[PDB]
Amino acid sequence: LDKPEAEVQIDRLITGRLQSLQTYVTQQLIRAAEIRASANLAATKMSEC
Amino acid sequence: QDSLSSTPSALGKLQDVVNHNAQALNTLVKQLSSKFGAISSVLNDIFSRLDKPEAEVQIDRLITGRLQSLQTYVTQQLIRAAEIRASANLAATKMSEC
Amino acid sequence: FASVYAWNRKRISNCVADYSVLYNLAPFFTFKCYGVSPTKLNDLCFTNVYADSFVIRGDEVRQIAPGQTGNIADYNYKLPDDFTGCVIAWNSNKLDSK
């Protein structure tokens, strides 16, 4: 492709694969919250049990 | 009072709440400069140069990109709200039990 | 007009540019603009305007554009891929033939 158009398809790949990274981070943020809650419970039981 | 005054980091968890919200809004503003494939980040500089059949193509790139920027803000702001809600529930429990 | 191998250039500045005048040079076979609509030129203002002029064959007119290659595009007159401006061409068989 000529530059004026080649950059358009490249821009499409960038936003597509960039959105993919975004999905990964978002899911890890939610998953992290789940682990933290478990860690907080484990710490509580250490102190009380 | 002495242990609070001599240690600026003593309240370095209430300040983090303030800092996270402040930078989240600064991030949004700084993303308005992005073109998202468009010839320009300035809307009025597109309609002033191109005709309707062309300006709409360029303008739609800016709209799509900026909608994603706002959606990201809301999603992350919502996750953070859950974190604060959890600590609020703990604070209320301690008020009751301590 | 100059030969294509040694095209001429004129600098345009400190003037009021009326673009409605040149639509009466010919049947006006080619008029293609890049980065701007042909009909918005009257509403814009430019920092520098340059007019490059030359004579080529009708089948070579297609080479006077961004991304194009060939004997004219590569050896005589090359435009940048980021070119902004308008290309005007018309048939001059009545003047330039013998």
PDB file of C-alpha atoms in Angstrom:
ATOM      1  CA  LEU A   1       0.000   0.000   0.000  1.00  0.00           C
ATOM      2  CA  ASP A   2       1.006   3.608  -0.632  1.00  0.00           C
ATOM      3  CA  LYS A   3       1.846   5.554   2.538  1.00  0.00           C
ATOM      4  CA  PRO A   4      -1.455   7.612   2.630  1.00  0.00           C
ATOM      5  CA  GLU A   5      -3.409   4.349   2.861  1.00  0.00           C
ATOM      6  CA  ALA A   6      -0.838   1.983   4.368  1.00  0.00           C
ATOM      7  CA  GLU A   7      -0.899   3.975   7.595  1.00  0.00           C
ATOM      8  CA  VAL A   8      -4.678   3.511   7.743  1.00  0.00           C
ATOM      9  CA  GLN A   9      -4.556  -0.278   7.863  1.00  0.00           C
ATOM     10  CA  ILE A  10      -1.640  -0.062  10.281  1.00  0.00           C
ATOM     11  CA  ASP A  11      -3.678   2.267  12.468  1.00  0.00           C
ATOM     12  CA  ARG A  12      -6.451  -0.350  12.403  1.00  0.00           C
ATOM     13  CA  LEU A  13      -4.054  -3.056  13.584  1.00  0.00           C
ATOM     14  CA  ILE A  14      -2.751  -0.804  16.345  1.00  0.00           C
ATOM     15  CA  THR A  15      -6.168  -0.030  17.796  1.00  0.00           C
ATOM     16  CA  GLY A  16      -7.273  -3.662  17.488  1.00  0.00           C
ATOM     17  CA  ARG A  17      -4.249  -5.203  19.209  1.00  0.00           C
ATOM     18  CA  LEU A  18      -4.179  -2.298  21.694  1.00  0.00           C
ATOM     19  CA  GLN A  19      -7.767  -3.058  22.700  1.00  0.00           C
ATOM     20  CA  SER A  20      -6.663  -6.638  23.276  1.00  0.00           C
ATOM     21  CA  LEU A  21      -3.999  -5.531  25.778  1.00  0.00           C
ATOM     22  CA  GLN A  22      -6.699  -3.405  27.432  1.00  0.00           C
ATOM     23  CA  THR A  23      -8.955  -6.427  27.947  1.00  0.00           C
ATOM     24  CA  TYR A  24      -6.080  -8.272  29.612  1.00  0.00           C
ATOM     25  CA  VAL A  25      -5.394  -5.460  32.074  1.00  0.00           C
ATOM     26  CA  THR A  26      -9.058  -4.985  32.940  1.00  0.00           C
ATOM     27  CA  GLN A  27      -9.528  -8.660  33.728  1.00  0.00           C
ATOM     28  CA  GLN A  28      -6.378  -8.713  35.863  1.00  0.00           C
ATOM     29  CA  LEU A  29      -7.674  -5.730  37.851  1.00  0.00           C
ATOM     30  CA  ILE A  30     -10.879  -7.604  38.642  1.00  0.00           C
ATOM     31  CA  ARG A  31      -9.056 -10.878  39.328  1.00  0.00           C
ATOM     32  CA  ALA A  32      -6.619  -9.056  41.603  1.00  0.00           C
ATOM     33  CA  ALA A  33      -9.502  -7.827  43.757  1.00  0.00           C
ATOM     34  CA  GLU A  34     -10.604 -11.417  44.282  1.00  0.00           C
ATOM     35  CA  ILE A  35      -7.134 -12.468  45.423  1.00  0.00           C
ATOM     36  CA  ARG A  36      -6.849  -9.508  47.784  1.00  0.00           C
ATOM     37  CA  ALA A  37     -10.105 -10.422  49.508  1.00  0.00           C
ATOM     38  CA  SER A  38      -8.784 -13.950  50.019  1.00  0.00           C
ATOM     39  CA  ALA A  39      -5.480 -12.604  51.328  1.00  0.00           C
ATOM     40  CA  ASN A  40      -7.348 -10.382  53.785  1.00  0.00           C
ATOM     41  CA  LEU A  41      -9.294 -13.374  55.062  1.00  0.00           C
ATOM     42  CA  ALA A  42      -6.143 -15.463  55.355  1.00  0.00           C
ATOM     43  CA  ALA A  43      -4.502 -12.699  57.383  1.00  0.00           C
ATOM     44  CA  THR A  44      -7.555 -12.442  59.629  1.00  0.00           C
ATOM     45  CA  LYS A  45      -7.559 -16.171  60.288  1.00  0.00           C
ATOM     46  CA  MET A  46      -3.852 -16.107  61.030  1.00  0.00           C
ATOM     47  CA  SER A  47      -4.502 -13.542  63.768  1.00  0.00           C
ATOM     48  CA  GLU A  48      -7.629 -15.189  65.203  1.00  0.00           C
ATOM     49  CA  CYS A  49      -7.056 -18.953  64.600  1.00  0.00           C
TER      50      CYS A  49
ATOM     51  CA  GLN B   1       0.439  14.393  67.581  1.00  0.00           C
ATOM     52  CA  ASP B   2       4.208  13.952  67.454  1.00  0.00           C
ATOM     53  CA  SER B   3       4.098  10.632  65.605  1.00  0.00           C
ATOM     54  CA  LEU B   4       1.653  12.113  63.086  1.00  0.00           C
ATOM     55  CA  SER B   5       3.643  15.319  62.581  1.00  0.00           C
ATOM     56  CA  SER B   6       7.092  13.766  62.289  1.00  0.00           C
ATOM     57  CA  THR B   7       5.890  11.292  59.661  1.00  0.00           C
ATOM     58  CA  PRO B   8       4.358  12.940  56.520  1.00  0.00           C
ATOM     59  CA  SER B   9       3.600   9.459  55.189  1.00  0.00           C
ATOM     60  CA  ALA B  10       1.361   8.671  58.172  1.00  0.00           C
ATOM     61  CA  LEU B  11      -1.753   9.601  56.180  1.00  0.00           C
ATOM     62  CA  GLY B  12      -0.312   8.280  52.911  1.00  0.00           C
ATOM     63  CA  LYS B  13      -3.419   6.283  52.055  1.00  0.00           C
ATOM     64  CA  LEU B  14      -5.980   9.047  52.212  1.00  0.00           C
ATOM     65  CA  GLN B  15      -3.714  11.140  50.018  1.00  0.00           C
ATOM     66  CA  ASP B  16      -3.550   8.264  47.519  1.00  0.00           C
ATOM     67  CA  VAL B  17      -7.315   8.454  47.078  1.00  0.00           C
ATOM     68  CA  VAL B  18      -6.981  12.133  46.241  1.00  0.00           C
ATOM     69  CA  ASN B  19      -4.027  11.544  43.910  1.00  0.00           C
ATOM     70  CA  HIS B  20      -5.662   8.710  41.961  1.00  0.00           C
ATOM     71  CA  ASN B  21      -8.760  10.726  41.134  1.00  0.00           C
ATOM     72  CA  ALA B  22      -6.740  13.810  40.212  1.00  0.00           C
ATOM     73  CA  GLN B  23      -4.505  11.975  37.751  1.00  0.00           C
ATOM     74  CA  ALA B  24      -7.438  10.072  36.251  1.00  0.00           C
ATOM     75  CA  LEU B  25      -8.980  13.341  35.072  1.00  0.00           C
ATOM     76  CA  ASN B  26      -5.650  14.703  33.850  1.00  0.00           C
ATOM     77  CA  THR B  27      -5.230  11.553  31.787  1.00  0.00           C
ATOM     78  CA  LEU B  28      -8.534  12.185  30.049  1.00  0.00           C
ATOM     79  CA  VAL B  29      -7.646  15.759  29.136  1.00  0.00           C
ATOM     80  CA  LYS B  30      -4.253  14.772  27.747  1.00  0.00           C
ATOM     81  CA  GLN B  31      -5.891  12.204  25.454  1.00  0.00           C
ATOM     82  CA  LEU B  32      -7.840  14.818  23.521  1.00  0.00           C
ATOM     83  CA  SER B  33      -4.654  15.588  21.603  1.00  0.00           C
ATOM     84  CA  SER B  34      -4.604  12.084  20.069  1.00  0.00           C
ATOM     85  CA  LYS B  35      -5.735  11.805  16.446  1.00  0.00           C
ATOM     86  CA  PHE B  36      -6.785   8.139  16.295  1.00  0.00           C
ATOM     87  CA  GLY B  37      -5.937   8.006  12.582  1.00  0.00           C
ATOM     88  CA  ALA B  38      -7.505  11.382  11.778  1.00  0.00           C
ATOM     89  CA  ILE B  39      -5.674  14.181   9.974  1.00  0.00           C
ATOM     90  CA  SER B  40      -6.241  16.391  13.016  1.00  0.00           C
ATOM     91  CA  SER B  41      -7.272  16.348  16.690  1.00  0.00           C
ATOM     92  CA  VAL B  42      -9.146  19.613  16.155  1.00  0.00           C
ATOM     93  CA  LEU B  43     -12.718  19.140  14.994  1.00  0.00           C
ATOM     94  CA  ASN B  44     -13.105  22.630  13.528  1.00  0.00           C
ATOM     95  CA  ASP B  45      -9.964  22.172  11.425  1.00  0.00           C
ATOM     96  CA  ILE B  46     -11.530  19.190   9.670  1.00  0.00           C
ATOM     97  CA  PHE B  47     -14.903  20.599   8.673  1.00  0.00           C
ATOM     98  CA  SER B  48     -13.203  23.802   7.527  1.00  0.00           C
ATOM     99  CA  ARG B  49     -10.971  21.970   5.039  1.00  0.00           C
ATOM    100  CA  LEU B  50     -12.822  18.873   3.831  1.00  0.00           C
ATOM    101  CA  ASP B  51     -16.302  18.458   2.351  1.00  0.00           C
ATOM    102  CA  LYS B  52     -19.086  16.524   4.096  1.00  0.00           C
ATOM    103  CA  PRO B  53     -18.393  13.017   2.565  1.00  0.00           C
ATOM    104  CA  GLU B  54     -14.772  13.318   3.694  1.00  0.00           C
ATOM    105  CA  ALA B  55     -15.047  15.281   6.932  1.00  0.00           C
ATOM    106  CA  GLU B  56     -17.386  12.671   8.384  1.00  0.00           C
ATOM    107  CA  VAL B  57     -14.840   9.931   7.745  1.00  0.00           C
ATOM    108  CA  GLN B  58     -12.172  11.859   9.632  1.00  0.00           C
ATOM    109  CA  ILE B  59     -14.525  13.003  12.393  1.00  0.00           C
ATOM    110  CA  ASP B  60     -15.828   9.485  13.070  1.00  0.00           C
ATOM    111  CA  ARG B  61     -12.292   8.383  13.921  1.00  0.00           C
ATOM    112  CA  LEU B  62     -12.107  10.996  16.672  1.00  0.00           C
ATOM    113  CA  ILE B  63     -15.533  10.104  18.043  1.00  0.00           C
ATOM    114  CA  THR B  64     -14.808   6.391  18.228  1.00  0.00           C
ATOM    115  CA  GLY B  65     -11.446   6.930  19.901  1.00  0.00           C
ATOM    116  CA  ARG B  66     -12.722   9.409  22.478  1.00  0.00           C
ATOM    117  CA  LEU B  67     -15.677   7.189  23.387  1.00  0.00           C
ATOM    118  CA  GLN B  68     -13.191   4.457  24.277  1.00  0.00           C
ATOM    119  CA  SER B  69     -11.229   6.910  26.429  1.00  0.00           C
ATOM    120  CA  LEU B  70     -14.335   7.725  28.446  1.00  0.00           C
ATOM    121  CA  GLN B  71     -15.345   4.080  28.701  1.00  0.00           C
ATOM    122  CA  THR B  72     -11.938   3.230  30.118  1.00  0.00           C
ATOM    123  CA  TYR B  73     -12.275   5.988  32.706  1.00  0.00           C
ATOM    124  CA  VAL B  74     -15.683   4.750  33.834  1.00  0.00           C
ATOM    125  CA  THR B  75     -14.606   1.116  34.034  1.00  0.00           C
ATOM    126  CA  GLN B  76     -11.536   1.849  36.138  1.00  0.00           C
ATOM    127  CA  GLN B  77     -13.354   4.428  38.255  1.00  0.00           C
ATOM    128  CA  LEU B  78     -15.972   1.760  38.957  1.00  0.00           C
ATOM    129  CA  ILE B  79     -13.371  -0.845  39.990  1.00  0.00           C
ATOM    130  CA  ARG B  80     -11.773   1.699  42.344  1.00  0.00           C
ATOM    131  CA  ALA B  81     -15.170   2.516  43.868  1.00  0.00           C
ATOM    132  CA  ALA B  82     -15.508  -1.145  44.848  1.00  0.00           C
ATOM    133  CA  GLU B  83     -12.180  -0.956  46.688  1.00  0.00           C
ATOM    134  CA  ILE B  84     -13.337   2.047  48.706  1.00  0.00           C
ATOM    135  CA  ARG B  85     -16.679   0.399  49.423  1.00  0.00           C
ATOM    136  CA  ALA B  86     -14.826  -2.557  50.929  1.00  0.00           C
ATOM    137  CA  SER B  87     -12.752  -0.346  53.220  1.00  0.00           C
ATOM    138  CA  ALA B  88     -15.876   1.605  54.190  1.00  0.00           C
ATOM    139  CA  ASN B  89     -17.523  -1.638  55.302  1.00  0.00           C
ATOM    140  CA  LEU B  90     -14.491  -2.416  57.446  1.00  0.00           C
ATOM    141  CA  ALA B  91     -14.495   1.057  58.964  1.00  0.00           C
ATOM    142  CA  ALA B  92     -18.173   0.699  59.840  1.00  0.00           C
ATOM    143  CA  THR B  93     -17.549  -2.718  61.385  1.00  0.00           C
ATOM    144  CA  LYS B  94     -14.739  -1.335  63.538  1.00  0.00           C
ATOM    145  CA  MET B  95     -16.862   1.610  64.629  1.00  0.00           C
ATOM    146  CA  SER B  96     -19.395  -0.952  65.867  1.00  0.00           C
ATOM    147  CA  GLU B  97     -17.056  -3.500  67.426  1.00  0.00           C
ATOM    148  CA  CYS B  98     -14.136  -1.352  68.710  1.00  0.00           C
TER     149      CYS B  98
ATOM    150  CA  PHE C   1       5.841  26.656 -20.043  1.00  0.00           C
ATOM    151  CA  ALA C   2       8.945  24.866 -18.811  1.00  0.00           C
ATOM    152  CA  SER C   3       9.974  21.362 -19.776  1.00  0.00           C
ATOM    153  CA  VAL C   4       9.073  18.742 -17.203  1.00  0.00           C
ATOM    154  CA  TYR C   5      12.718  17.851 -16.542  1.00  0.00           C
ATOM    155  CA  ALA C   6      13.297  21.452 -15.452  1.00  0.00           C
ATOM    156  CA  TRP C   7       9.956  22.600 -14.068  1.00  0.00           C
ATOM    157  CA  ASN C   8       9.489  26.220 -13.038  1.00  0.00           C
ATOM    158  CA  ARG C   9       8.404  27.567  -9.654  1.00  0.00           C
ATOM    159  CA  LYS C  10       6.780  30.858  -8.693  1.00  0.00           C
ATOM    160  CA  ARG C  11       6.390  32.094  -5.127  1.00  0.00           C
ATOM    161  CA  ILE C  12       3.038  33.548  -4.116  1.00  0.00           C
ATOM    162  CA  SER C  13       2.684  35.784  -1.040  1.00  0.00           C
ATOM    163  CA  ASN C  14       1.099  38.973   0.348  1.00  0.00           C
ATOM    164  CA  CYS C  15      -2.002  38.739  -1.886  1.00  0.00           C
ATOM    165  CA  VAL C  16      -5.710  37.911  -1.928  1.00  0.00           C
ATOM    166  CA  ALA C  17      -6.214  34.563  -3.610  1.00  0.00           C
ATOM    167  CA  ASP C  18      -9.409  34.257  -5.607  1.00  0.00           C
ATOM    168  CA  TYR C  19      -9.768  30.653  -6.731  1.00  0.00           C
ATOM    169  CA  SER C  20     -12.953  31.159  -8.759  1.00  0.00           C
ATOM    170  CA  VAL C  21     -10.979  32.806 -11.567  1.00  0.00           C
ATOM    171  CA  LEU C  22      -9.084  29.764 -12.863  1.00  0.00           C
ATOM    172  CA  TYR C  23     -12.150  27.646 -13.634  1.00  0.00           C
ATOM    173  CA  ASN C  24     -12.282  29.312 -17.056  1.00  0.00           C
ATOM    174  CA  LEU C  25      -8.930  28.175 -18.477  1.00  0.00           C
ATOM    175  CA  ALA C  26     -10.290  25.173 -20.338  1.00  0.00           C
ATOM    176  CA  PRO C  27     -12.905  22.386 -20.218  1.00  0.00           C
ATOM    177  CA  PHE C  28     -10.753  21.858 -17.140  1.00  0.00           C
ATOM    178  CA  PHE C  29      -9.932  18.167 -17.444  1.00  0.00           C
ATOM    179  CA  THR C  30      -8.199  17.573 -14.102  1.00  0.00           C
ATOM    180  CA  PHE C  31      -8.548  19.275 -10.747  1.00  0.00           C
ATOM    181  CA  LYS C  32      -7.681  17.194  -7.722  1.00  0.00           C
ATOM    182  CA  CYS C  33      -6.878  18.463  -4.213  1.00  0.00           C
ATOM    183  CA  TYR C  34      -5.082  16.721  -1.364  1.00  0.00           C
ATOM    184  CA  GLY C  35      -5.754  17.630   2.264  1.00  0.00           C
ATOM    185  CA  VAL C  36      -8.371  20.171   1.195  1.00  0.00           C
ATOM    186  CA  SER C  37     -11.619  20.416  -0.758  1.00  0.00           C
ATOM    187  CA  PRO C  38     -11.594  22.386  -4.086  1.00  0.00           C
ATOM    188  CA  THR C  39     -14.583  24.328  -2.763  1.00  0.00           C
ATOM    189  CA  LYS C  40     -13.161  25.330   0.618  1.00  0.00           C
ATOM    190  CA  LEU C  41     -10.072  27.098  -0.745  1.00  0.00           C
ATOM    191  CA  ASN C  42     -11.900  30.429  -0.851  1.00  0.00           C
ATOM    192  CA  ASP C  43     -12.448  30.256   2.929  1.00  0.00           C
ATOM    193  CA  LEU C  44      -8.908  29.355   3.972  1.00  0.00           C
ATOM    194  CA  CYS C  45      -5.654  31.370   4.411  1.00  0.00           C
ATOM    195  CA  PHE C  46      -2.179  30.026   3.689  1.00  0.00           C
ATOM    196  CA  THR C  47       1.341  30.839   4.899  1.00  0.00           C
ATOM    197  CA  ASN C  48       3.098  29.980   1.632  1.00  0.00           C
ATOM    198  CA  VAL C  49       1.791  29.199  -1.837  1.00  0.00           C
ATOM    199  CA  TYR C  50       3.989  27.869  -4.641  1.00  0.00           C
ATOM    200  CA  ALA C  51       3.063  27.243  -8.256  1.00  0.00           C
ATOM    201  CA  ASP C  52       5.040  24.565 -10.105  1.00  0.00           C
ATOM    202  CA  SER C  53       4.463  24.473 -13.871  1.00  0.00           C
ATOM    203  CA  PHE C  54       5.399  22.120 -16.731  1.00  0.00           C
ATOM    204  CA  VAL C  55       4.206  20.315 -19.889  1.00  0.00           C
ATOM    205  CA  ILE C  56       3.699  16.533 -20.124  1.00  0.00           C
ATOM    206  CA  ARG C  57       1.633  14.011 -22.109  1.00  0.00           C
ATOM    207  CA  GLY C  58      -2.007  13.409 -21.204  1.00  0.00           C
ATOM    208  CA  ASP C  59      -1.243   9.777 -20.231  1.00  0.00           C
ATOM    209  CA  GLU C  60       1.402  11.108 -17.796  1.00  0.00           C
ATOM    210  CA  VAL C  61      -0.972  13.370 -15.875  1.00  0.00           C
ATOM    211  CA  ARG C  62      -1.788  10.461 -13.575  1.00  0.00           C
ATOM    212  CA  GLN C  63       1.857  10.460 -12.431  1.00  0.00           C
ATOM    213  CA  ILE C  64       1.508  13.893 -10.867  1.00  0.00           C
ATOM    214  CA  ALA C  65       0.239  12.599  -7.549  1.00  0.00           C
ATOM    215  CA  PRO C  66       1.448  11.224  -4.157  1.00  0.00           C
ATOM    216  CA  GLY C  67       2.451   7.557  -4.181  1.00  0.00           C
ATOM    217  CA  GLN C  68       2.899   7.450  -7.954  1.00  0.00           C
ATOM    218  CA  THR C  69       5.919   6.113  -9.836  1.00  0.00           C
ATOM    219  CA  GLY C  70       7.170   6.220 -13.429  1.00  0.00           C
ATOM    220  CA  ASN C  71       9.439   8.218 -15.732  1.00  0.00           C
ATOM    221  CA  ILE C  72       7.918  11.533 -14.697  1.00  0.00           C
ATOM    222  CA  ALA C  73       7.251  10.754 -11.057  1.00  0.00           C
ATOM    223  CA  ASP C  74      10.785   9.420 -10.484  1.00  0.00           C
ATOM    224  CA  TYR C  75      13.093  11.285 -12.882  1.00  0.00           C
ATOM    225  CA  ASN C  76      11.427  14.651 -13.540  1.00  0.00           C
ATOM    226  CA  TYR C  77       8.919  15.797 -10.892  1.00  0.00           C
ATOM    227  CA  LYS C  78       8.357  14.086  -7.540  1.00  0.00           C
ATOM    228  CA  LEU C  79       5.670  14.932  -4.974  1.00  0.00           C
ATOM    229  CA  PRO C  80       5.868  13.910  -1.275  1.00  0.00           C
ATOM    230  CA  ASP C  81       3.434  11.362   0.159  1.00  0.00           C
ATOM    231  CA  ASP C  82       2.340  14.037   2.627  1.00  0.00           C
ATOM    232  CA  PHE C  83       1.645  16.577  -0.122  1.00  0.00           C
ATOM    233  CA  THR C  84      -0.980  19.222   0.547  1.00  0.00           C
ATOM    234  CA  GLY C  85      -2.221  21.277  -2.374  1.00  0.00           C
ATOM    235  CA  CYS C  86      -4.128  21.062  -5.682  1.00  0.00           C
ATOM    236  CA  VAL C  87      -3.138  19.710  -9.094  1.00  0.00           C
ATOM    237  CA  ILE C  88      -4.581  21.455 -12.154  1.00  0.00           C
ATOM    238  CA  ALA C  89      -4.203  20.239 -15.726  1.00  0.00           C
ATOM    239  CA  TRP C  90      -5.753  20.905 -19.107  1.00  0.00           C
ATOM    240  CA  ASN C  91      -5.377  19.961 -22.767  1.00  0.00           C
ATOM    241  CA  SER C  92      -3.243  22.432 -24.712  1.00  0.00           C
ATOM    242  CA  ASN C  93      -3.034  20.693 -28.100  1.00  0.00           C
ATOM    243  CA  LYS C  94      -4.110  23.934 -29.779  1.00  0.00           C
ATOM    244  CA  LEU C  95      -1.007  25.740 -28.473  1.00  0.00           C
ATOM    245  CA  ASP C  96       1.760  23.178 -27.891  1.00  0.00           C
ATOM    246  CA  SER C  97       1.625  21.066 -31.069  1.00  0.00           C
ATOM    247  CA  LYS C  98       3.015  21.535 -34.579  1.00  0.00           C
TER     248      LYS C  98
END
